[PDB]
Design a protein around this ligand. Structure first.
Ligand SMILES: N#Cc1c(-c2cccs2)nc(SCc2cccc(CC(=O)O)c2)[nH]c1=O
Ligand SMILES: N#Cc1c(-c2cccs2)nc(SCc2cccc(CC(=O)O)c2)[nH]c1=O
Ligand SMILES: [K+]
Ligand SMILES: [K+]
Ligand SMILES: [K+]
Ligand SMILES: [K+]
Ligand SMILES: [Zn+2]
Ligand SMILES: [Zn+2]
Lengths: 334, 334
């Protein structure tokens, strides 16, 4: 029904080294029909298909797979938290506007998840205010960390305060793992580095008092919380054993916040999905696909259809019900 | 009945900075009765009790907790893979001999797992052969990586080949995670760094072809494999979707290796333990405690015994049966 985890790019965008005056950016080249390359200062790193930018193609594959709504967000490599703040804000506004146009073209099939200049919180609050009031976005997508800041950093608290005030949902996506060293092999940053990033982000928001200070803030973590649903016992036990190290910014045990945030259902395995629903809750698991990248779910929702343990009310919660709750929307997409 | 995961230190050892000519080593200083300080070049990093060195104290606690046998291994901070090879080997002789003398004093309560100078595979094979033949150890404890080498590195294959031949089991313990920067907070190196170090180690051994090339090698991973039982779906899926990044040293899928290695049961929560035996297998999960450190299990086997889902045959496999099969020992312990 609803896919909370899908990425989209504009059909094109200007040379960002020319626009801003320094390198490190991502561009897009239509080298042949139906395909395109993603470059970084000339060096290609991935090839994408038409479904990465063309909404016409996405709607076709959405009807084919049974998907009703896609929550569109940018590709996390575009976060650009490393750049100068004024330049990231410029890029965020470019990416957010293209999202708004794609959503208003098919308001029954798309919702928008914006991008924020997280390195400059005063600018990110303003761009969030524009994303909610003007662009009508139900939420934004942010990384699991912002340069040397984990999501516990006090500098980020005005952004959380604004998001809780604006009723702006947060989708926390892992990015900027170590790409070299020992991690330059076996696709380790994707297979292991990204789940570790999400686990760090969950712990950092819990022990940083984020969920405590902003109880109404609605957060969702990608890839089923990473390793958190399995390692929560170790984390919870460690908090109890060393409160001098873990209980200084927030005194509550991390298990208290089970049921205070969401994760997506992208775990590929039924055993992993059952533990996910068992630990996080049947009301806090949302169907996500990572469309259109191949590391995601090929048949959206097939893993939830196959679970004989879930009743039909629970399947419909993971397929679409929990997405509506996290986004703060109603059933207006028949 | 059997605890495969417990650490012990010698009561004393000389000034290592003077023994080897450089700093960075660990010293044990007794400041009070029943307590001692661990120093890294004068700076304390934890206070330990007498049960970390005194075997008499361990015996009393083992009787009171119901533990028949402890597998004694050194504390991973003593791995010393960063130092000169001939100096780390010097330390391995000191640690393994002291480990050996504690086993001969109570030979039905202890078996030894020696330490090796893994940064010099040729010396490691020598000292390991000495451990098995001259000292009688059924295995050794090694880290999840040796400097820039992961456990897939072909430089370490002489260690694996000697292990299959000598019938020497490998207990792989996470160590040398990032300790500073973003990880310097909330005990993250132990709560998140250690499980991730172990997940990387399982992936490197699988995708490096270690289990295929040494099918009789007996390997056990610590802390329930870290994140592997929960994220094996994503790891297996990422292997099939990108054979050009993962399948260049071993074409077999990671799922085919569920059942080719052991993990301990140190996962603290019932749902984590049930998933652990669902993925790794009821015959490949071993009771481990991390004695005497507080992050471990205070009452060994209490979690296993409380599992209503398990039959008595399964509980005995986790309590002692799987440890004996992994260590390759018979019931010489009454
Ligand atoms: N290596 C490598 C490599 C790279 C990069 C190298 C350096 C910077 S990005 N990008 C891609 S495209 C899909 C994508 C790109 C960026 C973030 C995400 C988050 C997710 O959906 O999982 C997915 N595919 C690759 O294999
Ligand atoms: N931070 C910090 C910190 C440190 C260190 C800092 C730098 C080097 S060690 N050591 C201890 S003592 C038990 C122990 C020490 C070393 C490895 C293991 C593996 C296991 O869990 O069994 C346990 N406790 C701490 O909290
Ligand atoms: K919202
Ligand atoms: K920053
Ligand atoms: K053995
Ligand atoms: K137990
Ligand atoms: Zn994604
Ligand atoms: Zn340990």
């Amino acid at each position: 029904k609803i896919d909370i985890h899908s990425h989209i790019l504009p059909k094109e965008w200007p040379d960002l080294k020319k626009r801003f005056g320094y390198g490190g950016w991502v561009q897009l080249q239509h080298h042949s029909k139906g395909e395109a390359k993603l470059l970084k200062d000339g060096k290609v790193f991935r090839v994408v298909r038409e479904n990465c930018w063309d909404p016409e193609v996405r709607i076709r594959e959405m009807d084919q797979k049974g998907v009703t709504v896609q929550a569109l967000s940018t590709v996390p490599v575009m976060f650009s938290y490393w750049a100068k703040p004024e330049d990231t804000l410029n890029l965020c506004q470019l990416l957010n506007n293209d999202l708004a146009s794609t959503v208003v073209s098919y308001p029954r099939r798309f919702v928008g998840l914006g991008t924020l200049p997280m390195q400059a919180p005063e600018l990110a609050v303003k761009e969030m205010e524009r994303c909610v009031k003007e662009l009508g976005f139900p939420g934004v997508q942010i990384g699991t960390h912002v340069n040397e800041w984990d999501l516990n950093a006090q500098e980020l608290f005005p952004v959380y305060a604004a998001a809780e005030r604006l009723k702006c949902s947060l989708f926390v996506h892992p990015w900027d793992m170590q790409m070299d060293g020992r991690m330059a092999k076996y696709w380790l940053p994707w297979l292991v580095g990204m789940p570790a990033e999400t686990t760090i982000a969950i712990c950092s928001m819990i022990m940083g008092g984020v969920f405590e200070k902003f109880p109404k803030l609605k957060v969702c973590f990608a890839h089923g919380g990473g390793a958190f649903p399995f390692t929560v016992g170790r984390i919870s036990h460690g908090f109890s054993m060393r409160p001098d190290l873990c209980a200084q910014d927030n005194p509550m045990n991390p298990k208290k916040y089970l049921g205070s945030f969401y994760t997506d259902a992208l775990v590929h395995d039924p055993l992993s999905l059952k533990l996910l629903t068992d630990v996080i809750g049947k009301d806090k698991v949302i169907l996500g696909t990572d469309y259109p990248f191949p590391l995601g779910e090929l048949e959206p929702g097939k893993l939830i259809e196959s679970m004989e343990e879930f009743d039909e009310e629970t399947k419909n919660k993971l397929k679409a019900g929990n997405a509506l709750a996290f986004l703060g929307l109603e059933r207006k997409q028949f």
